[PDB]
């Protein structure tokens, strides 16, 4: 399976614009990931990381994005917050693994890397694995509005990038390796 292609990718999207890579019809080697020091966080929900090699799935979805370290914790079931509610939500259910690493020497810059954005205003929260990449000036009561007039605010903001690259493996023809 094309795991390295996702984790060691040279470019990641914003959280609000998280990208979904589908893994299927392949052998999922989780040993490289499991005991590597690449990741600062290796969190699985109801799934034993050690046993990932022994689990078969219809498919695996690797959701890729860059989020400030502080908000990495929002990428989990049962969470609230600007990211959990407006940028990228995980369902209240079992989950595969949320894998993340520090990217201060990759994505962060001395003046702040503001190429990455996030949502903070929206007419309601996001559903689990919903992607909202629209950019229409926010209006608190559904009215038409034009910025920078009063009550007219852009729903998106910029990240003051320390950033972490996060890849979420959501589990639904893919299995781990066999040993000869």
């Amino acid at each position: 399976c094309p795991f390295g292609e996702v984790f060691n990718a040279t470019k990641f999207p914003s959280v609000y614009a998280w990208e979904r890579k589908k893994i299927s019809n392949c052998v999922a080697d989780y040993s490289v990931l499991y005991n590597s020091t690449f990741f600062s966080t290796f969190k699985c929900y109801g799934v034993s990381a050690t046993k990932l090699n022994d689990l078969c799935f219809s498919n695996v979805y690797a959701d890729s994005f860059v989020v400030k370290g502080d908000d990495v914790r929002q990428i989990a079931p049962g969470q609230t917050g600007v990211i959990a509610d407006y940028n990228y939500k995980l369902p209240d259910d079992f989950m595969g693994c949320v894998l993340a690493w520090n990217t201060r020497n990759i994505d962060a810059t001395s003046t702040g890397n503001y190429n990455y954005k996030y949502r903070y205003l929206r007419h309601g929260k996001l559903r689990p694995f919903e992607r909202d990449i629209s950019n229409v000036p926010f209006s608190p009561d559904g009215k038409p509005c034009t910025p920078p007039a009063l009550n007219c605010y852009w729903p998106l903001n910029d990240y003051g990038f320390q950033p972490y690259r996060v890849v979420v493996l959501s589990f639904e023809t893919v299995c781990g390796p066999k040993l000869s």
Partner: antibody
Amino acid sequence: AQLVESGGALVQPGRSLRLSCAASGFTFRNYAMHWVRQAPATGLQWLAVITSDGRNKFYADSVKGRFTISREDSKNTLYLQMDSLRGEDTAVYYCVTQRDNSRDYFPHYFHDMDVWGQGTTVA
Amino acid sequence: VLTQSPLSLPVTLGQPASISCRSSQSLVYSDGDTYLNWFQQRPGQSPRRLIYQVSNRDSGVPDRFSGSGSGTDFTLKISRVEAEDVGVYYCMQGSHWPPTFGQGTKVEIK
């Protein structure tokens, strides 16, 4: 969480008045701040909110463009700048915030409004 | 827009009372919750919250205060009204911006 209003006065229509509200018992910087006024005409009427970072300012249509909400975190003080005052603006102005900032983002800072000051009269 | 009833509640000391609040629109928010709170303003004092999220009470609030409701129709209930309960009971909605209050119900002790 204690809020203390001041700056109330009698001001002729067309003129301006600026209110202030000192905060104590909590960290001012960590909460959004609101102004609400009281009068027989409206009962309790929400006017404006300024977010914790002082960036987003939302106003009721009834004051939108006439009132400006601002804050000085360094003084733990909330302000309200009211221009072109009318007779209809006669009310007791209350300084309002929240104790629970678990969800410090729009619109969740309108959900509790559980911290009120003593209120100051503006006429 | 919130409307309360009665405008004034004449309750004999030690007897129960209830204050109604009716919204022009459902107060259920986008997350499924309902942000309908109740406040009491005692003469000479500012408003204080008693009940929140329709039926929950704040710490320090007497157990005699409770409530119920859904959609547009909400009620604040007082199992027994004491002399110290004199004041104007307001309902407030934060579900739809701008947040609004009812006109308030003046509860007095007879």
